[PDB]
Amino acid sequence: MRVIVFFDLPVITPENRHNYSVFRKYLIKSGFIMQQKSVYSKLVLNLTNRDSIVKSIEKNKPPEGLVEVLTVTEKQYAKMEIIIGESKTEYLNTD
Amino acid sequence: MRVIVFFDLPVITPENRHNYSVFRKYLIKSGFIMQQKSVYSKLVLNLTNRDSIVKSIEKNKPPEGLVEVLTVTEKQYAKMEIIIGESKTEYL
Amino acid sequence: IELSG
């Protein structure tokens, strides 16, 4: 399985931005990989570990913001559609 | 199923933020509902409707950034863990 | 424009 963490943390104040980097570092230290600026994922090999992971996130939660933790299968994760921003009137790389 | 669209768009310049609001407005116009900032979801009855939604997102994508589309069951979505920084429900 | 995805 894959555990996907979506977080919506404030970045208004200097304390907000510090706490944002603290949570990001905790995720990295925990073996999560950045998918986007606010979305991190971790491979889970056994379901026993999954809720151990959720308990750790809860205990290490930032003081403000919303963190949501979704568990998906590896096939759902591997077939995620990736759409890359491109202008409609973009020039093509002539090599 | 439930389709989850999470995006990571630049917000540095005023044009970036304008482009961010245009894509957000497009998602809302398509019937997506905000789950949190930069994360939107929509119920889909079958994968044909799913792939039409994704095709429309591709044709309406912003000039820069990453848009990702995840499809999960409604049961998987309902068991999402919700963690709030200030949880307590006190009324004034 | 004829999107394949």
Author numbering:
A (entry chain A): 1 to 95
B (entry chain B): 1 to 92
C (entry chain Q): 3 to 7
Quoted from the paper:
Spacer acquisition step in CRISPR-Cas system involves the recognition and subsequent integration of protospacer by the Cas1-Cas2 complex in CRISPR-Cas systems. During the spacer acquisition step, the heterohexameric complex of four Cas1 and two Cas2 proteins preferentially insert a protospacer at the first CRISPR repeat region following the leader sequence. Here we report an anti-CRISPR protein, AcrVA5, and reveal the mechanisms by which it strongly inhibits protospacer integration.
The initial model was further refined by Phenix/refine and rebuilt using Coot, with the final Rfactor and Rfree values of 19.51% and 23.21%, respectively. The complex structure contained one Cas2 dimmer and one AcrVA5 peptide per asymmetric unit, with crystallographic statistics listed in Table 1. The crystal structure of Cas2 reveals a compact dimer structure (protomer A & B) in which each chain is composed of three α-helices and five β-strands (α1: residues 14–29, α2: residues 47–59, α3: residues 74–78, β1: residues 1–8, β2: residues 33–36, β3: residues 39–44, β4: residues 66–73 and β5: residues 81–84). In our structure, the interaction between the AcrVA5-peptide and Cas2 is facilitated by a series of interactions: a hydrogen bond between Lys59 of Cas2 and Ile3 of AcrVA5, as well as non-bond contacts between Lys55 of Cas2 and Leu5 of AcrVA5, Gln58 of Cas2 and Leu5 of AcrVA5, and Lys59 of Cas2 and Ile3 of AcrVA5. The buried surface area of the complex of Cas2 and the AcrVA5 peptide is 434.56 Å2 per molecule, thereby suggesting that this complex could be physiologically relevant. Structure superimposition between two protomers of Cas2 reveals a high similarity in the overall structure with a ferredoxin-like fold with an r.m.s.d of 2.03 Å (overall 88 residues), except for the significant structural conformation variation in the C-terminus. The structural heterogeneity observed in the C-terminus was most likely caused by the interaction between Cas2 and the peptide of AcrVA5. Although the β6–β7 region in the structure of Cas2 is unresolved, the binding of AcrVA5 in the α2 helix of Cas2 causes steric hindrance with the neighboring protospacer. Consistent with the MS results, the K55A mutant rendered Cas2 insensitive to inhibition by AcrVA5 in degradation dsDNA substrates, which shows that Lys55 is a structural determinant dictating Cas2 inhibition by AcrVA5.
